[PDB]
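To assess whether the prediction recovers the assembly geometry, we first specified each molecular entity separately, as shown.
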Amino acid sequence: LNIFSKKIISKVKQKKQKLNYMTSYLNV
Amino acid sequence: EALLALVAQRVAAERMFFTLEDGSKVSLWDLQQYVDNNPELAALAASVRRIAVADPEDPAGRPLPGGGASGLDRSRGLTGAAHMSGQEAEELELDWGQVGRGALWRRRPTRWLLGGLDGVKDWELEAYAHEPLANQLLGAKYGGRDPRAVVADPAYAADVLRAGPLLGMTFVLRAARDLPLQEVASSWRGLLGNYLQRQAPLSLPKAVRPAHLDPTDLNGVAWPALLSRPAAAAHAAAEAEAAGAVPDDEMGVAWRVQSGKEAAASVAAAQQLLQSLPDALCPGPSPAAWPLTGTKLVDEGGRNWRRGGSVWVTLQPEGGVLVQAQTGGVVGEQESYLLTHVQGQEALAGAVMSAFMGPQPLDPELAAAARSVLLVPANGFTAANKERDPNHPLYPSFTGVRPGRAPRDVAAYTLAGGRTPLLAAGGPGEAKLASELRTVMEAALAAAARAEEAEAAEARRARGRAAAAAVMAEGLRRLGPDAVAMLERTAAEAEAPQGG
Amino acid sequence: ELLKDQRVKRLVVYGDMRTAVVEVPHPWSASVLGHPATHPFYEDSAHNRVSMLRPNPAAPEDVTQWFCAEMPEWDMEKYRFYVDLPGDFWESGVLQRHLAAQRAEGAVWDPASGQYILPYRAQKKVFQVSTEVQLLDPQ
Amino acid sequence: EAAYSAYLRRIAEAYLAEHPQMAAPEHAAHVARVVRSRALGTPLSFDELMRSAVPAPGEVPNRNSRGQVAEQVRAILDQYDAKTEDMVDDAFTTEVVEEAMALFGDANSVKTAWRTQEVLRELSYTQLWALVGEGHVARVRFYGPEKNKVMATT
Amino acid sequence: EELEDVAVRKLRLEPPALQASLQERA
Amino acid sequence: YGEGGLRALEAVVGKAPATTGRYRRDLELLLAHPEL
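The predicted structure of the complete assembly is given in tokenized form:
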């Protein structure tokens, strides 16, 4: 949605991938 | 407020009860709570998960040996229809056997043109009849006669048209196309109006016994106690003459005539109930407000009826017409909906029955096939061989024994002891053993006559049966196993095929 | 022998159906025992390794017959052995018999006392794991 | 068959001492029921009954192999190269915690893991059998020139 | 607590809420 | 077919591990000392 909540979701996805590469994160 | 003294009080305390197995009575409120407020068990119910019991009398568990893969359970992956093994169809009631096939053609396929490329099919027509009721009605009258003569007589066609609600003829119309709703409603309304304009005042049954299923035993039925009475036929006839006494042959049904199908009444009432088809199926223009929407019987927009959905029209007695439906595709995902149920509309049941099996039906092949199949459940055989009868007229069961060819050898032929049944009929041994069986039976008939309203007569018949069984048993031990076989085949080739 | 003892966590059969990789867990990684050799994956608020060793009422003198929940596979440490299967491996039906033994029990209803009971035969012992048979596609 | 007797005795003692007395002359059928239940095995709840043996594909955590741990150590050691109130409660040194997770940790402390997220999150034959027996598989489609593979829709 | 951070979460004990989430909610 | 011809365990709990038994002392010591 718009641009702001298209940047927030992109940043959250990047941190989710970083967490999956390091931790026991789920659904990534 | 909102019926606070009426919607409360547990609706007449829910004084209507059920009956499970060992006479235990449960309230309808308890059972409704069991199906409504107990959804954890329903989660298992819509998952077909297998669990298997444990043996209660075993010290060490030991899961009880069960075979549960019943026809409905295994068939959940199939499409269109389930599949059983005959015995499982004999169980779970399932007594409506198919008697005819048909089709409601838009343009009839010609063998010319391009093989039949104009063959648009609107519906596939199947007719089903209750086989035990078909036996009990059309078998004790039209049983044991020449079937060609029976189907040639116009009285048999009139009788299978009149006794249609009694047989419970249900017609399944399965949609073979994405049919528009308005077109199908208009077509059915026009056809049924055309058949209502020719529905002359004709014959209907009249009730000989009221009641049954009082509001304490809604699980139970009255017909096994009615048929297993201490005198049975005498009691039934006594009830009959105190109301409508059977005028016909061995069929029952008093058959009031003419006026029973009133004209300005039920025929016109049905001509209005048909007018409330395109204002009950396609109401005011909003395809999301039309009742048949959202469900899988129609598409997403509700405009068209999906191909594969079926409409089940069952003709009950007393003019009751039950219209149900069933979605198509995988039976494990099929959902069945009750659409409507009208009661007292004797013109609707008669008009639908005439439209399907009349002098001019919607399908002459279906009408001829149904009126021709019906003699097979009339002769005590059912349409499909559920009982695995070897003497079935169509689809007979086989013995499972390889046929024997006589070899041109000598070592295969052995002269053993008395281990062959008699197969030569008419010989001197067969005639003399028939004579010895004859004198044994004559001794049994003589001994059963010394065993000394209708209930005492039936008790005397039971005493005569006991004495005859004793004398016949002593005579059969005097005679041989070949005489046992001869008595068995004499008893088998003496009763009517209807079972009377 | 390891397959019959249910000590094999994974059995990866390759494309030719004649060579298998047998993932057998390290013994202290085979179940949630709290052995200090394993990495402390599972700790309580007292920073103690969690042990889930339920005693066997049929064998109180033999702790090796006691019951234990198997570890999550992703937390296991597994030897990966190479096995050259014979050409009649599928004809002999040893894997089929093991699968039929494993899938023959679990979640049994008990009318003598109510409740659904998971039987002790359906549970695992101290070092017994559920065998996961996975076949590979050469395509 | 005397072992059965001693066994049920042990289960009786177990329940009687485990739940604080409560046995009494009363509740004898309850005691017999729980003795039979604990003798047969473990009484499952409904949630434990419907729990699938097969884990969810999102439920499998990542476990790095040794080479992937080396990649993590290199990435972490490469990367970098206001009032105290509003400061988040999780205000630790991100680099130090990341490196202390690349060492030890859970995803980095197996030393034997090999494609732990690629193997798993993938149906095998036994997991497909469990899903089918639990009524979780909608459709099975045999494909291939040999028809030895299926594409199961759950 | 930590006894829920790992003991019931990583070890996949505590089966998912189906009875409560179906009766109390649905 | 075959030779010979004429003829609270293993049915409640089910068998007993055979490869196991060398870890019995370690299991007993782990139970005896929970601080390990």
